[PDB]
Design an enzyme around this catalytic site. Sequence first.
Site, PDB file in Angstrom:
ATOM      1  N   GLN A   1      -6.756   4.415   0.456  1.00  0.00           N
ATOM      2  CA  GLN A   1      -6.158   2.666   0.538  1.00  0.00           C
ATOM      3  C   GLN A   1      -6.185   2.393  -1.097  1.00  0.00           C
ATOM      4  O   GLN A   1      -6.770   2.386  -1.663  1.00  0.00           O
ATOM      5  CB  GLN A   1      -6.653   1.797   1.409  1.00  0.00           C
ATOM      6  CG  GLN A   1      -6.139   0.812   1.987  1.00  0.00           C
ATOM      7  CD  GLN A   1      -6.142  -0.414   1.412  1.00  0.00           C
ATOM      8  OE1 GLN A   1      -6.999  -1.200   1.607  1.00  0.00           O
ATOM      9  NE2 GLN A   1      -4.973  -0.968   0.846  1.00  0.00           N
TER      10      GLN A   1
ATOM     11  N   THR B   1       0.886  -1.474   0.123  1.00  0.00           N
ATOM     12  CA  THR B   1       0.071  -0.079   0.014  1.00  0.00           C
ATOM     13  C   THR B   1       0.818   1.230   0.170  1.00  0.00           C
ATOM     14  O   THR B   1       1.709   1.517   0.957  1.00  0.00           O
ATOM     15  CB  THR B   1      -1.078   0.028   1.361  1.00  0.00           C
ATOM     16  OG1 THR B   1      -1.704  -1.175   1.355  1.00  0.00           O
ATOM     17  CG2 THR B   1      -1.986   1.336   1.174  1.00  0.00           C
ATOM     18  N   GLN B   2       0.588   2.032  -1.255  1.00  0.00           N
ATOM     19  CA  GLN B   2       1.476   3.269  -1.195  1.00  0.00           C
ATOM     20  C   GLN B   2       0.501   4.684  -1.394  1.00  0.00           C
ATOM     21  O   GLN B   2      -0.669   4.395  -1.263  1.00  0.00           O
ATOM     22  CB  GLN B   2       2.179   3.261  -2.557  1.00  0.00           C
ATOM     23  CG  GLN B   2       3.448   2.390  -2.774  1.00  0.00           C
ATOM     24  CD  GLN B   2       4.361   2.524  -3.840  1.00  0.00           C
ATOM     25  OE1 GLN B   2       4.466   3.390  -4.097  1.00  0.00           O
ATOM     26  NE2 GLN B   2       5.124   1.456  -4.055  1.00  0.00           N
TER      27      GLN B   2
ATOM     28  N   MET C   1       0.145  -6.487  -3.425  1.00  0.00           N
ATOM     29  CA  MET C   1      -0.374  -5.271  -2.795  1.00  0.00           C
ATOM     30  C   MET C   1       0.726  -4.235  -2.479  1.00  0.00           C
ATOM     31  O   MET C   1       0.395  -3.624  -1.413  1.00  0.00           O
ATOM     32  CB  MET C   1      -1.217  -5.677  -1.454  1.00  0.00           C
ATOM     33  CG  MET C   1      -2.318  -6.441  -1.775  1.00  0.00           C
ATOM     34  SD  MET C   1      -3.622  -5.626  -2.728  1.00  0.00           S
ATOM     35  CE  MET C   1      -4.088  -4.322  -1.354  1.00  0.00           C
TER      36      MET C   1
END
Lengths: 233, 212, 240, 231, 195, 222, 244, 235
Positions: F1, A1-2, A107
Amino acid sequence: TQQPIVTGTSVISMKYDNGVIIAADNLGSYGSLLRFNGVERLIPVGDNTVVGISGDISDMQHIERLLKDLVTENAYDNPLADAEEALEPSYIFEYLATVMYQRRSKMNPLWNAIIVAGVQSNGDQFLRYVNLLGVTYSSPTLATGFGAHMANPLLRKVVDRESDIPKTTVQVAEEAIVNAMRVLYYRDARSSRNFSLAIIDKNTGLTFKKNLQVENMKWDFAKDIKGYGTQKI
Amino acid sequence: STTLAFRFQGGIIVAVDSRATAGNWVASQTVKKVIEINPFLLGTMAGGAADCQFWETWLGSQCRLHELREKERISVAAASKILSNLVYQYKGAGLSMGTMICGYTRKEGPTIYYVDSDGTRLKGDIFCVGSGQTFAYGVLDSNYKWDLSVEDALYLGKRSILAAAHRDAYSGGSVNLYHVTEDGWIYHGNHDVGELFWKVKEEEGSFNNVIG
Amino acid sequence: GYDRALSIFSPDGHIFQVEYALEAVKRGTCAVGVKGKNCVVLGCERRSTLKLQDTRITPSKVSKIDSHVVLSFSGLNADSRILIEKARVEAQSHRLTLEDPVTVEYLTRYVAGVQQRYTQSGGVRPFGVSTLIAGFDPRDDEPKLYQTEPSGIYSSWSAQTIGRNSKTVREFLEKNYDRKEPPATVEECVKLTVRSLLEVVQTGAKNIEITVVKPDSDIVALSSEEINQYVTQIEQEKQE
Amino acid sequence: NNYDGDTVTFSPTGRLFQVEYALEAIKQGSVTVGLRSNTHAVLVALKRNADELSSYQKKIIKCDEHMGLSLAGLAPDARVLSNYLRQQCNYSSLVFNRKLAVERAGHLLCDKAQKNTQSYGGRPYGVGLLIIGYDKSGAHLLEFQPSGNVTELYGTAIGARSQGAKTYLERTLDTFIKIDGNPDELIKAGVEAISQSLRDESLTVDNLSIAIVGKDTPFTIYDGEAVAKYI
Amino acid sequence: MDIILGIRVQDSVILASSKAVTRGISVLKDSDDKTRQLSPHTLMSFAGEAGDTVQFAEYIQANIQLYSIREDYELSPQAVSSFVRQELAKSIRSRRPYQVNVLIGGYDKKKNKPELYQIDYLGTKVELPYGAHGYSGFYTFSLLDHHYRPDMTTEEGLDLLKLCVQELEKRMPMDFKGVIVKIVDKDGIRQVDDF
Amino acid sequence: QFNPYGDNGGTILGIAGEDFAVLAGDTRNITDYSINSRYEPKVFDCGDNIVMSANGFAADGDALVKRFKNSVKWYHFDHNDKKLSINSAARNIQHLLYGKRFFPYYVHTIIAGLDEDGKGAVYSFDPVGSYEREQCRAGGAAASLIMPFLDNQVNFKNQYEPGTNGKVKKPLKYLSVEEVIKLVRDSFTSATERHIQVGDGLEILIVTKDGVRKEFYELKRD
Amino acid sequence: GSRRYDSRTTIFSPEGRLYQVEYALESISHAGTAIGIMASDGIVLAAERKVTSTLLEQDTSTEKLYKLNDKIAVAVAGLTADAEILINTARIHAQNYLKTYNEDIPVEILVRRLSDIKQGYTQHGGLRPFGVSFIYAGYDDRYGYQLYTSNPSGNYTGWKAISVGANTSAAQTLLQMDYKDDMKVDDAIELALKTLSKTTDSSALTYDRLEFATIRKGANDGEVYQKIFKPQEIKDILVKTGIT
Amino acid sequence: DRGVSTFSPEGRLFQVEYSLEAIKLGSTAIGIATKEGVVLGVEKRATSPLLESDSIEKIVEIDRHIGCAMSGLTADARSMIEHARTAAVTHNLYYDEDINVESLTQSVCDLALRFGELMSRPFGVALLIAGHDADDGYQLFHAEPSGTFYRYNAKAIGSGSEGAQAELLNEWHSSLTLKEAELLVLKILKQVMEEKLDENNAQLSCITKQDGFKIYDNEKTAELIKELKEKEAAE
Ligand SMILES: *[C@@](C)(CO)[C@](*)(O)[C@H](CC(C)C)NC(=O)[C@H](Cc1ccccc1)NC(=O)[C@H](CC(C)C)NC(=O)[C@H](CCc1ccccc1)NC(=O)CN1CCOCC1
């Protein structure tokens, strides 16, 4: 997640009769701050491919290093590295497309939208898109970000389908790209006036143009506009 | 879905509907919810389609490996427990399965095991599983006796699915019937609710709520 | 981890480590198994060079794997404990998953599979143990008697013996045991077992152990006096 | 003598005896021939049988639509190496949308065989391979030896009495190299080449095994009645 | 799973466990035995999360049976209860804990005394004269506080137990379909068929 | 997210005849309210007379097709060039899909071809691997528009024989390749009219014993 | 590679014997003799220290007799360092059992586990076995007073009276001669010392060359007491039996 | 000593060659393939008369369409069979079809060379794998510990193999019936066996497309033994 930090905006491109054109402005935005102004977002691979990248710049620089390393690796134990076994646009794209999808599947994506423009060894035009999700598609015109919304409509008026490609010259095609860059400067709040443009032709090869500027802009009509409805001064 | 299976004098009846839904979208009317594990074992399917379909065909492979290794057909208890122990390993992961392992063996006789995805495993004479289980229970329980004939038991199983197919919005399509005896399972046909409902209404005189 | 291949083939096609494990079995005290019409009896030798022993607490030669299956052995005593433990765990595991106790064939097949695994695994030597596994399958009245050996082969026997001087007692059983008519009662089966051990043992005092297994988890070990009565009876009939 | 206990030991004259003993297993293996022109590449293999009741051991394995090999020596080792080649050819296709070069194929095999000759516990591969293929630089023929040495050639042969076929090809070099756009004639030259390695036995219908790859020809294998044409 | 009770009297331990198995708005079964025999003189009832209950009970059962074979000896109820507590004490700090509450009723043959242990899913063990898990305790404890005496017979214990079941059938919201009663004493474990 | 899924739109359609089978799909690719491509094929020849399409999230669609194509290749290597039957392919695809049960491929998969008796076969899959052979299946964005029309026109649902007092059903019969293509074209033109994600072009793959033929038709580009 | 230097500790001889176990027993046979004698009302443990030096600190020394828990003790014969490794393992095992069941560990269970560890070193791992033989003396409420022995093979057996270490052949004959079942602790104490006195390789048996311990129910009412004898207490018991 | 995966100067693996000697000591097993089916027969060879011969399991089912016979260190075959059975069932699960006899054999033979310094030594057992599939029909394979497998029209393995193979060379033809093959296995087994052949010390089996793999009863084999003796005396 960025979350993307330093970002690059639209990359636009189209096919013409003998090759492909691709362009992207030289800005590195930091949110609303127009932080960096000397950023090159078109990266040539060999003398037959140009990869245009938008989105996170730190990830763009990572991709640069991969492509650079790909050229080195290809040259190893390869007498025909500058001939029959040279890197094709289709090879370079598929490699990036693989990486992009692998990263999204872990992810931890490379927060980018990428357009690989080039000319194959048999003379065929190559133009294909890939993004952080690993989604891929090809079209006579391709664009990222605001380019998708504003450039594509303009570029599709020139090349609306496959049969329009042989009818489109490099002069007409470049003119449309340069026009699209101006429209983006009018309307995209994270764009800059300065940009780079690249032409990959099957005859004349790779022509990389730096330090171009948007020009022939219409601003004069602004003086007549007063108030927001009822003001006459 | 709606699935039932009950034990009686003449063995086991197994009846299921054939509907498959994705929300309110009726995705299929022709799904096989009975898995034929072997000539003496059946498995019913309710819940997540893939979860049921995948793991019950897997169950069949495990049952085959048992009779290769042990030179003997697997018991209904052992077969059900393989499935229950499997889904228990996946407990909390979000599997959705409401199954019934029905069959006959010499040592056990006719046997039914309810097995679901939260690890519950129950031996019993009557079970109804699925979204329309309550509708099936209403008709089945009120007409059930141990001394039903093979002909009457088959009909009661069929009529109970029909009852649920009608009232439950997420059940329907057609009724698949099975009868399990000491000689193995016997298929008793696919019965489309489209024709069966009106045939039952006319002949039985029931379903007076509907405009005839 | 220690990886060395200890059990390997020789030019003549033999695995010497497995064959030397058989020699350890040949050194071990004699054990005999005889199955009758409605029972199995496991007889075991105990060497009498050990006086001042405490027979209450000394490990018994016959071990219960489950309430319906027993295991005796010949060879290395320490090695036997490992096999017995594994077998006992597998017995409980089988009840847990299959909801039914093990068959004597299944339990034997497992123990034999363990013995085999140690003949082609790196860093381990074969078990210096041969076992006699006896009992009755659940809800069954047919007597079962199986034998295993270090190599991993196993098979069913009407009657069998293993250990030291086992070839002598096997000779005895081969002519005295009738396939067409096995020992009809418990007494007949125990007597034949004691007789066979008396060919080898020495004295019939605290040298012979007998264990009788009957259907439906009915296992009992005979005491000294009970066994001594068979010894006394056989010797009086012998003088003829 | 004292220096052949394992692959990790050098002899006093700088030899690796285990690698040489692996090389010996190839010499015992049945003969197989490889040769190419500019358009096509051909494998010819004499298959071997246990007896008249048995089948004939298959010598040729396909790796991709444009590449494959023939084996001589331990067949299970050829299966391991061919499977590795299949994966590498396949990796190149999925990741780079690119047909694996026959030269890289050779480099990958060389490096895989080498690792087995420098480490304790392992052993060298006991098989020789003749890889043919058609890629972006035309037709190719490689010879793999389990020492690690891979060599690109116009033609060659490995196995028992392979010197006969290898001498023939060395004489015929100028002829068969120019057999362009003619599959059947290039095979004929290969069948005549393997014939120079025959003693007492001749080429029958279930004995001969031929394979071919080229410009407009995917790697295909011919057995049974399909090779009756060339006898 | 809902109602499990336990009463220790002079010479025995009596366990009562509800027969109902309910999921959703359907009583799937009304003849469920919520107990396992751990050894000839030790019985464990259980209640809690679906699947966990039986899986845990059978796992304990297998372990105690394994011990009995290995040592040719029956573990004391105290020893078994300590083993069970430790397993639950491990479980509560696992990735997925067993959500199972148990009562262990046993007869110690060495002491010639009945013993009742109450253990919750956290691994909280207590020895008691009478015990319960879940909402049952909120009625039965006060009732037993009043009517229980330590020197009662097994028959008096069963009447005391009937008094609990009647109160539960009167005031509990859910239909638990009666109880299966079992007695643990010097002669082992036996079931009361008519309750 | 970060959201690892996306919707690329489009719709697909499979119909089975007596000695043939068709697998159709529009060539439009989209994200949100933007067109990415007007011609991006998503119906593929996978070899062994099996055509496949995995509609929904295109990245997962391409990954699946890519893996299945590779599965066909290795099936030949491991089993002496044996032809992969449509029923065997279907089961193999179930395991591919269910292999990612806890991080699914967001696609509706359809395959078409011929069964081992030479008869037309269509199989359809949900995202996690549940599959079923059918005469008829639409999948994707406009499946809810097309599918009931297919029930009516392919399987003759709710159609009774005139004058029989709704007692005799319209008898089931196989359709010709000509009649099937008419239904496919009308299905997609209707779907294009009323669904914004469907349009641009229609590509049909027809499968007979002779091989895999293609046909292309223009659709409305608005 | 390393294969060249591997002794192969866990293999069979052609006769079906474990080389290393046999040679470990040969090592133990040179160790100081240790005797265990079980009576009806207690157990005696007696052990001879290995050729003592006059400047050895005798009172604060432990070579032969070790305490495993309150109810179980062991007499050692062989390498002391090896024994201590096994003793700490045994001590831990006893506490695990107590922590699990809230009951003191039964003697046989402790003995079996320790013997199973030794067995492991003879069958796998490629390590040398422990050059140690134990005499376990203990009490539990199931079997009462118990004597066991274990050796490098991992094989254990129960005894009424037993010796390990040096001169066991001669020692076992003497025990077998004078032992009887209705014996008391005080009589067993005398037998243990008399046996060592005759089998010793020393000139005369003295207090400084001995370790001694008893496990009686001599505490107050139904409880077991472990007495590891002090130097002065051994001196007194040696005079009391008329050896010095 | 020396490495497990060592080559001899002649170019063979010592351990593989030594395991072949162990197989020669094993009891005889014969297989014959026909167009009506494949027949598998074995010598039981009970070491003592007290041993219950029906517990000797040297013929084994892998799937309904594949059977197996063994010879040599038969204990080693258990994990080979276990693998074969799992391979057969697993393939059915993945592909909803029976698995090819050749593919099954190949899967088993992949275990063979997975030894060294994986298991510590090669297998000391040879297998005869017989089966049927729709593609290549009735097949008989000989799977060795070298990792190699040959297809055979007929094959004998074990102590009397070279003598039996020479006999199978003369007797086999492409038009053999199933009944003719059954008798031929019994005939050749009786020749190479030490003890006199009967229903208790020899076992027959076959695999047919229709009925699948079947081990014959001792009653059925006994009649074939009686039929065999009568036919030899008849000329
Ligand atoms: C009655 C009819 C209802 O329970 C029966 O129980 C049947 C049982 C038969 C099929 C075995 N149950 C269902 O039909 C079951 C209901 C259900 C759905 C989802 C979760 C639990 C229960 N239906 C399904 O499983 C359908 C079957 C398809 C339509 C053939 N599948 C889906 O809904 C799929 C898979 C959902 C899913 C489950 C678990 C993990 C991941 C996904 N979902 C989609 O296809 C998504 N959706 C479809 C419509 O288009 C947009 C995307």
